[PDB]
Amino acid sequence: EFNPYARGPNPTAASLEASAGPFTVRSFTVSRPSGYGAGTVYYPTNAGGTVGAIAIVPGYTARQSSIKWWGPRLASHGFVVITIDTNSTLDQPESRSSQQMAALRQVASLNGTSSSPIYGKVDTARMGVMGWSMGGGGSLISAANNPSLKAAAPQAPWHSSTNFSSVTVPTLIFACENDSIAPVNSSALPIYDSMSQNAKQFLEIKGGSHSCANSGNSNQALIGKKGVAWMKRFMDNDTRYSTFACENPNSTAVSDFRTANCS
Numbered sequence: 665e666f667n668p669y670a671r672g673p674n675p676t677a678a679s680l681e682a683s684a685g686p687f688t689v690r691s692f693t694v695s696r697p698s699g700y701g702a703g704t705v706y707y708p709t710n711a712g713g714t715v716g717a718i719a720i721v722p723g724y725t726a727r728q729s730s731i732k733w734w735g736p737r738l739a740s741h742g743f744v745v746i747t748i749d750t751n752s753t754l755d756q757p758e759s760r761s762s763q764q765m766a767a768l769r770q771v772a773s774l775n776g777t778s779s780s781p782i783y784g785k786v787d788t789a790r791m792g793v794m795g796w797s798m799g800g801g802g803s804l805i806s807a808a809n810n811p812s813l814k815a816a817a818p819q820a821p822w823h824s825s826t827n828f829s830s831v832t833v834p835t836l837i838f839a840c841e842n843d844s845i846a847p848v849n850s851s852a853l854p855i856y857d858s859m860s861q862n863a864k865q866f867l868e869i870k871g872g873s874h875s876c877a878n879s880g881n882s883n884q885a886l887i888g889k890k891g892v893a894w895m896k897r898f899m900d901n902d903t904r905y906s907t908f909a910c911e912n913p914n915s916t917a918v919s920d921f922r923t924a925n926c927s
């Protein structure tokens with residue numbers, strides 16, 4: 665069927681590995697954050713139609729800088745992306761999930777706000793969640809509590825419980841092989857293995873420390889391709905991205921790859 669959510673040119677490995685997607689990106693600081701500490705909104709100026717919204721949360725002690733690279737990278741492919749700072753840098757996963765969802769709520773509110781740069785740019789029914797470490801755990805809590813979310817793609821996630829068997833949202837877990845903060849064997853892989861009801865994927869970056877998917881990482885072509893492909897496939901229902909979303913990269917930079925129920 666004609667997909668009313670399809671945006672942008674037909675993807676290629678090259679187009680998805682590039683630093684920038686097809687759309688021009690602008691950004692603004694949120695003047696009065698509603699339910700979180702601070703936020704930057706990244707948006708395409710020329711997507712050609714309304715686009716989904718993604719909210720991204722940092723890890724413990726961390727700020728927008730740790731996750732900022734996702735803002736332009738995703739927005740340039742046709743998303744409105746909010747990177748947040750938490751109320752406290754020492755907020756835990758449940759609080760991070762609440763704040764992530766408050767950020768999505770504010771982006772949806774701004775779609776209806778005539779003074780906003782994202783006035784009329786958002787499809788409030790199509791949302792995604794991403795984040796690092798405790799903000800990754802928070803993303804999985806967000807998905808568990810809000811199953812109408814269309815996609816989740818946390819990185820090096822941690823939560824006090826690894827049991828996300830209730831999650832029905834398509835979930836891509838970025839993991840870091842040599843993580844010594846939230847070891848893969850005790851955190852990311854148990855989380856991945858808990859999820860039985862969803863499309864899901866596990867992508868472990870070989871030799872990576874806990875920060876392996878953060879701003880300034882040396883694998884932006886692969887990690888950015890996978891994140892954009894997952895969000896395109898599931899937030900936009902865009903089957904042009906089915907092979908990019910589901911494929912094993914068969915990459916010497918990937919130490920572990922798993923996927924299930926992917927189409």
Ligand SMILES: *[C@@H]1O[C@H](CO)[C@@H](O)[C@H](O)[C@H]1NC(C)=O
Nearest residue numbers: 698699700701751759762763
């Ligand atoms: C974040 O702080 C705002 C402002 O005080 C508040 O409305 C919100 O409830 C806080 N969120 C959490 C999860 O503590």
Ligand SMILES: *[C@@H]1O[C@H](CO)[C@@H](O)[C@H](O)[C@H]1NC(C)=O
Nearest residue numbers: 775783784785786787788789
């Ligand atoms: C966002 O606003 C635009 C223009 O007013 C509108 O066409 C669109 O439906 C809105 N989004 C949602 C999800 O209602």
Ligand SMILES: *[C@@H]1O[C@H](CO)[C@@H](O)[C@H](O)[C@H]1NC(C)=O
Nearest residue numbers: 826827828829830857858859
């Ligand atoms: C996770 O929680 C579900 C729901 O209680 C339970 O049936 C299951 O045993 C737990 N799963 C794991 C993977 O420990």
Ligand SMILES: *[C@@H]1O[C@H](CO)[C@@H](O)[C@H](O)[C@H]1NC(C)=O
Nearest residue numbers: 677907908911912913914915
């Ligand atoms: C991985 O290899 C399989 C089997 O040869 C192939 O179907 C798939 O395209 C490969 N992935 C990439 C990125 O080429």
